[PDB]
Amino acid sequence: KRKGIILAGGSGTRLHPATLAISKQLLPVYDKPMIYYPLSTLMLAGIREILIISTPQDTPRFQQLLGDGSNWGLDLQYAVQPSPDGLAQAFLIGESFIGNDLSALVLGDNLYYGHDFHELLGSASQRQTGASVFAYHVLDPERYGVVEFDQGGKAISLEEKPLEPKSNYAVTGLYFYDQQVVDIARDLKPSPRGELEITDVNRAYLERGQLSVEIMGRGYAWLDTGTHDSLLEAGQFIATLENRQGLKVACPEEIAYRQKWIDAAQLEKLAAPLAKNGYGQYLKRLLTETVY
Amino acid sequence: KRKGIILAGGSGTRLHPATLAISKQLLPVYDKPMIYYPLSTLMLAGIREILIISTPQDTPRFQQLLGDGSNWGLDLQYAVQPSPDGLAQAFLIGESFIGNDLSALVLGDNLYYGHDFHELLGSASQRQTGASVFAYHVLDPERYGVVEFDQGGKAISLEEKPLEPKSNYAVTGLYFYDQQVVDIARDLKPSPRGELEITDVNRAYLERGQLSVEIMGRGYAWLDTGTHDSLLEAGQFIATLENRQGLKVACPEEIAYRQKWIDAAQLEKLAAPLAKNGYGQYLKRLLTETVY
Amino acid sequence: KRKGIILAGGSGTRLHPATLAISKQLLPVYDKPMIYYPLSTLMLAGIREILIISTPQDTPRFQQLLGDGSNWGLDLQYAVQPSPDGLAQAFLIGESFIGNDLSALVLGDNLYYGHDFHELLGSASQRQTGASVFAYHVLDPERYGVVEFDQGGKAISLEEKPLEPKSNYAVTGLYFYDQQVVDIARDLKPSPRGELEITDVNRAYLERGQLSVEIMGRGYAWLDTGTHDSLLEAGQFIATLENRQGLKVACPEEIAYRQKWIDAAQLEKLAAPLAKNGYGQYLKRLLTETVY
Amino acid sequence: MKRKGIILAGGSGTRLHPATLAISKQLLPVYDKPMIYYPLSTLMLAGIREILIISTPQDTPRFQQLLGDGSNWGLDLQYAVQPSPDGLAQAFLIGESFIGNDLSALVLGDNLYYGHDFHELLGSASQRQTGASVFAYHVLDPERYGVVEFDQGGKAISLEEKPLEPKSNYAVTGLYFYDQQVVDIARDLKPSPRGELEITDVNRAYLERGQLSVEIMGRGYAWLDTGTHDSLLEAGQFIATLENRQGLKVACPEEIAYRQKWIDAAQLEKLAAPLAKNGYGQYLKRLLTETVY
């Protein structure tokens, strides 16, 4: 069994005053809440039991939004991160939730999209030992954890926000772990930046030869809503795809149904109060149209 | 002396699920909350005393974001509209706030921008008798109150969301009134749509020969940010202007300073907590740069 | 070996006056000419010998832009389509070019993108019998050839621009054919719309049980620059991906180098004249950077 | 009084290659119509009917194919070649015969202006009969343009061309109005350090004589430059947003011609006919019966 975690807290200050009223992850991307996107990523990976970690103030907001998850065939739980003191804190806050299971962590403002994503997730998901992360070529690797490869394509180093990046491959905000992750996180000390760093957790696996680094090719989109510009671009990206296709991206209701976590009747009931708009009309359409 | 009202409620049904555990007029338009835009419009009209009317759920959210306005040299008050039963309800909810003063109403999701806008507003503000509204050419006039002109350019009729519009001129969501408006609203009955209609208020002034309809030229932008698509377009519009100019659109801090409602010391103190980002850095710059 | 055709002609009357000056397929999509995109698609399918068909006025302009292709390891040839009388005319105009070989046709204004695209292409291109086309879920199937599937997923009918589509699956503007296509096209007569239709070619194959319809999943982007709005959307889509990734979409120089059709020395020479710009700088970077 | 117009639509295309290998930047569409319609429309709105379009030797025939002699729009369009992009002031040398003994105006072919009361801002400048007039606009990146510095009283005191350390954030836009002194000023210029015959140097000549009028173009106007891939996209989106919202089109020369009475209703109807199967033609037709304020 693999349990999921969505880390959806974080500083806030960079995007104020936009984020003074609404935290990033509660800011919607085009037609649905930002959190739907990383949630749908965990769902597509086959994960149904998910811990949502947020700020003290947002945690109840997330509860109002998503509830216990039973509507979507999920088991959703909530915990608080008092201060954004590092991605790795997710494993300390989520220690009891994880128990003795495997796990996966996704960042609440990360938006993934592309063909054969289910396979990419599936292969990481099937690894019962070690950790798996994904490498994506970016313009600005200095903003991320950076993974360096040797001439043979083997991952050989990790550095967090390096002033002098060794490659243009960023480690994306999606991570799969075996049962070791909690104890690794328990042993970490704050970095210079003052954070309990996921890069340090991933490096612990790398130095034991237990880190799988999979390329996420250029045909995928991996976007982050970290800036005003990047939220706008992400919105435009989703809107172009949706309006071209007549399909919606990262609808949890759709994914639940396709995965047999909810049935047609359940789906019909979810669509009713959204009936007056495109999103409800869309869910109803799913009951009678085959989509490959 | 004119008091202002921002009517920022409305059914959110259309925009769900994007706006579920948050407020729709708190969504960013690019880089700042949507409500900053209409607020800035009233401020540019020389209005300091403003009543913000929203839903039971969202009114507290506005208060938390904007406070009493004193930081910006404003007097902000708040009131609740229990149910979205008409734009004209603003004048009933707002009756005691208005007192014996002139007034102006702007809708929370209306974004205006253009050259000489302060003159356009100044002109309506300086009419102490009757009402003033603005007509703007649109592609889909059936969505709005529509104003028909005679061959001489005189306004001759108003219809609310007509099936067969008599022109392509929509009445925008910005309205200036003398002391007759509360009494006119007091006497209204709900329409066939089942709403207490601002068009019926504007028609009451027109039937007495006391409605001024001013053309808002095609050089102005009048955007309505109340749909997912139109929110994205508005965001891009503001981003293009801001990044081209190195100026920000609709910063209340700037407008308050320019109007001498707050002094330099005050502006400096507002910028401090936003210092880490572009917005705080911008406010600081206004202290030592002349902008015409 | 399979030969390719890019049909890059067509009535421009729609996009006038924007295309009064230029053929639609010479307009840039963001940072490079539209024709680079379908050219790159053929290259990615392993096709090196390509006939570009355009109008009398433009064909020489395409020759000016692309030359004989030798610089990119290609064999580019040219032919004129006197009048835009149907997509199937490509096979009559290109009869001598195709000779006794397998072939592929791509429309000059079609932009495809997504993960594992080279696999989707290679599988169709490496078939040696029948015809292969791709079905993509769209909002507006009435604008395209539409494929209807039975309950088992088997394609059962094709209709060109039906007013009441039987599905939401459009046939995309990318077609792969065995040696039967020319004789099929020769027997066609103009449709009700006045055109020699590729849909009729594809039906001929379907009737013989020799049409392979492969799904192009929602993870792929299939865009059409046929309208002002859609060309703008496609530009933003490419811009977002490029700026995120620090990679460029559909650079023929890159693809030729990667396929080993040109070497490093040749790539370096192609970059030099573009060195003062981002595109040339990019081609240079590819010489010392490994991209997975 | 008549003013003659010049659109300088030449330039090194190297930057935008390969997008502009096929087409010159100034023929690329901004959303729905060719880039050059925009600065052409600016001149038209200023009351200028007689215009010289300057471009490279390769592009000159392309502009001539698109626009012709302008008679269909009530204009008198002429063409000339700039052999090499050796300075904006070259426009006055190349255009000397064309200008003759008249007032003149120069607009750059990739400059897009839009906003309320723009006709008034233009008419004020164009109706002056002395000196030069230019416009100052606040930008984020003044180092890309000519930059004007003001004193504490708002009077222009200096001009610098593409300064590494701008003295202000006010760029001089690519729209210039001149009296009959300009040709002789340009004739006396020598190339700058950038190796160009600079319009900034022409403008400084006027400033030194106290004959340069620098008018602020306020923040409510949009002044966009389509000279990069990103900027052309943003400009397209800007136009598309306004057009789709309004049901009106920006910088349609047929509309402006008709509104200025340079062509009549029958003429407009004929222009609409060949574009009728699209929205641009349908739009021209609509203008014959709808009053637009």
Ligand SMILES: Cc1cn([C@H]2C[C@H](O)[C@@H](COP(=O)(O)O)O2)c(=O)[nH]c1=O
């Ligand atoms: C550092 C940190 C980030 N975050 C969130 C914000 C985004 O959803 C995500 C990315 O954060 P970042 O802005 O530091 O790159 O992780 C936390 O939730 N907690 C933390 O301690």
Ligand SMILES: Cc1cn([C@H]2C[C@H](O)[C@@H](COP(=O)(O)O)O2)c(=O)[nH]c1=O
């Ligand atoms: C190799 C290569 C692929 N492509 C396109 C083909 C696809 O749409 C995508 C390949 O993505 P992938 O590596 O994730 O399968 O990139 C380029 O545009 N240029 C290239 O050089």
Ligand SMILES: Cc1cn([C@H]2C[C@H](O)[C@@H](COP(=O)(O)O)O2)c(=O)[nH]c1=O
């Ligand atoms: C009808 C109504 C609208 N509104 C807000 C909703 C939008 O933000 C805007 C548009 O209203 P309308 O298009 O339904 O006339 O007005 C209220 O705040 N209260 C109301 O009673």
Ligand SMILES: Cc1cn([C@H]2C[C@H](O)[C@@H](COP(=O)(O)O)O2)c(=O)[nH]c1=O
């Ligand atoms: C009259 C006219 C104006 N314009 C432009 C000029 C300004 O940018 C704008 C005029 O706006 P205004 O009517 O609000 O002053 O519209 C056109 O693009 N076409 C026209 O036919």
Ligand SMILES: Cc1cn([C@H]2C[C@H](O)[C@@H](COP(=O)(O)O)O2)c(=O)[nH]c1=O
């Ligand atoms: C009908 C037709 C289209 N075309 C071109 C124009 C495009 O690249 C594409 C389809 O254009 P369309 O928007 O007119 O259907 O193929 C031709 O080259 N020849 C033709 O006979």
Ligand SMILES: Cc1cn([C@H]2C[C@H](O)[C@@H](COP(=O)(O)O)O2)c(=O)[nH]c1=O
């Ligand atoms: C099945 C499904 C996939 N997706 C996303 C996941 C990947 O980003 C993408 C998969 O596309 P594919 O079918 O071409 O592999 O679509 C949804 O957004 N909703 C869904 O219901």
Ligand SMILES: Cc1cn([C@H]2C[C@H](O)[C@@H](COP(=O)(O)O)O2)c(=O)[nH]c1=O
């Ligand atoms: C210098 C120069 C520029 N131009 C064009 C190029 C641009 O589109 C614009 C701005 O040029 P600039 O950025 O080099 O001052 O003017 C010419 O047509 N001829 C010239 O001699």
Ligand SMILES: Cc1cn([C@H]2C[C@H](O)[C@@H](COP(=O)(O)O)O2)c(=O)[nH]c1=O
């Ligand atoms: C003074 C000021 C105006 N504006 C807006 C009001 C109008 O839409 C526009 C005025 O432009 P203008 O100076 O060209 O008349 O700018 C702000 O957004 N912030 C400000 O501080």
